Amino acid sequence: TGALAPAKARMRELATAYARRLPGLDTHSLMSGLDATLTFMPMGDRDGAYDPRVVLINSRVRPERQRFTLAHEISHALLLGDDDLLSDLHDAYEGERLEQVIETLCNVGAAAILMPETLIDELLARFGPSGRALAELARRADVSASSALYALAERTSVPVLYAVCAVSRLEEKALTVRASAGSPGVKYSLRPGTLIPDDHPVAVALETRLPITQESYVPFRSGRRMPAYVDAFPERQRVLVSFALLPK
Amino acid sequence: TGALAPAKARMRELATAYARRLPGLDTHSLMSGLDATLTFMPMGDRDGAYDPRVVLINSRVRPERQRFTLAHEISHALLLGDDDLLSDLHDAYEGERLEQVIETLCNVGAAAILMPETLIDELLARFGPSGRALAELARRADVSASSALYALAERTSVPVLYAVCAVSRLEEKALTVRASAGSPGVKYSLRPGTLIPDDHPVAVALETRLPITQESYVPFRSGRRMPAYVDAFPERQRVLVSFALLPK
Ligand SMILES: [Mn+2]
Ligand SMILES: [Mn+2]
């Protein structure tokens, strides 16, 4: 219900087309088709900046995030390029809502360029709806775990709650859910900052540095333990996990 | 004879070390260890700019040249980093001579990072002292043909005059020698702008778009025809060629 879904489809079309024109999905190739001045400067904590036409990217953030920022700005330009899509958006949204839709479309396009549906479907085929597949997508696409989490969950055909867990400053430091996403049908969500029990398979994966795949529970902050099969892949001081909700 | 040779060795050492620290030789990885603001802006025809600490690269030049420019600035910083090398240079050269030595060392270091000796020796082993090996080095290293030409010629153990030929504005357009280099012992050089005869194998390669390997002559502007075996590889509207001078 809404003009966002058809707009997202058009964004993916434009993004996929620009990608095929690119020699590769390498950061340099993306910069090549930017068609605008791009400046990488240190600037505390921020994904990046847009262009009127000068694009800016923080050099303190990890390269993966800079890649997504660049794809976002490419998608923004691609959007402002197609007059039809822009007219459709302006004939449907206005003010903050239009800005939110544009931002969402830019993020939708960025993922379409960096993470192709083929790659995701192939990885889901080889590794299944698992945290290992999440790790593969993030590495094979050189993207942040959070970005891959949303893309992988969107194309999962089974009830799965993917999650990216890592050590956090909490309130001193502990393993917390950094990001979470559910497959199209999942009716649950994992609060960011949720603490991972030390006895939990995800924590064992971080300590052992070995992939852990066992039946466990979703570590809800309510002390509730929803039965689920957990596939945890440890990587870069972060644990990519898959919570397969089981009917029980 | 001179302090340049030992300086070049130290430059290669520092450059090789920084390269091994890099995750890969991808343009992004090189930018990661720049440790300085980098800005890509259109600016007519120019390889790039140095930093006091902001590096600048022309966006109108091909990506391969931008890669070499980035490696050059990394080598320059690497040079200014090692106090010993800089002291040695200042204890040996001064004024314009020092600037020339620094520039040469920066170019020596840039090639060391982008084109490893292993890669060159491997390609020379599989394809031999040929224009095909020149094409492979330029592609496998994502570097300009001119840069690869000098690196390949430096490690060729046989008398070979490598050359990069392409269509030029001449004085209207014709196939001309864009760049040339000889193996360590070659006692000849090919003038840039030398015209390639239409009957010459190099020209046939450009028209046929097929690799040509036959016995021919070095097309000297003096009408002189020095006997040589010619291996011409056509690629990207440019012909990478190898002139194997034969004793005869
Ligand atoms: Mn934007
Ligand atoms: Mn310099």
Residue numbers in the entry:
A (entry chain A), B (entry chain A): 19 to 70, 73 to 191, 201 to 277
Provide the authors' original text about this structure.
A protease-based derepression mechanism in response to DNA damage was characterized in Deinococcus, which is controlled by the specific cleavage of repressor DdrO by metallopeptidase PprI (also called IrrE). In coordination with the transcriptional repressor DdrO, which binds to the radiation/desiccation response motif (RDRM)-containing promoters upstream of DDR genes, the specific cleavage of DdrO by PprI induces the expression of DDR proteins following DNA damage. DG-PprI, which is comprised of 9 α-helices and 8 β-strands, contains three domains: an N-terminal zinc peptidase-like domain (residues 19-135), a helix-turn-helix domain (HTH domain, residues 136-176), and a C-terminal GAF-like domain (residues 177-277). Single-stranded DNA (ssDNA) physically bound to Deinococcus geothermalis PprI (termed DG-PprI for brevity) and stimulated its protease activity in a length-dependent manner.
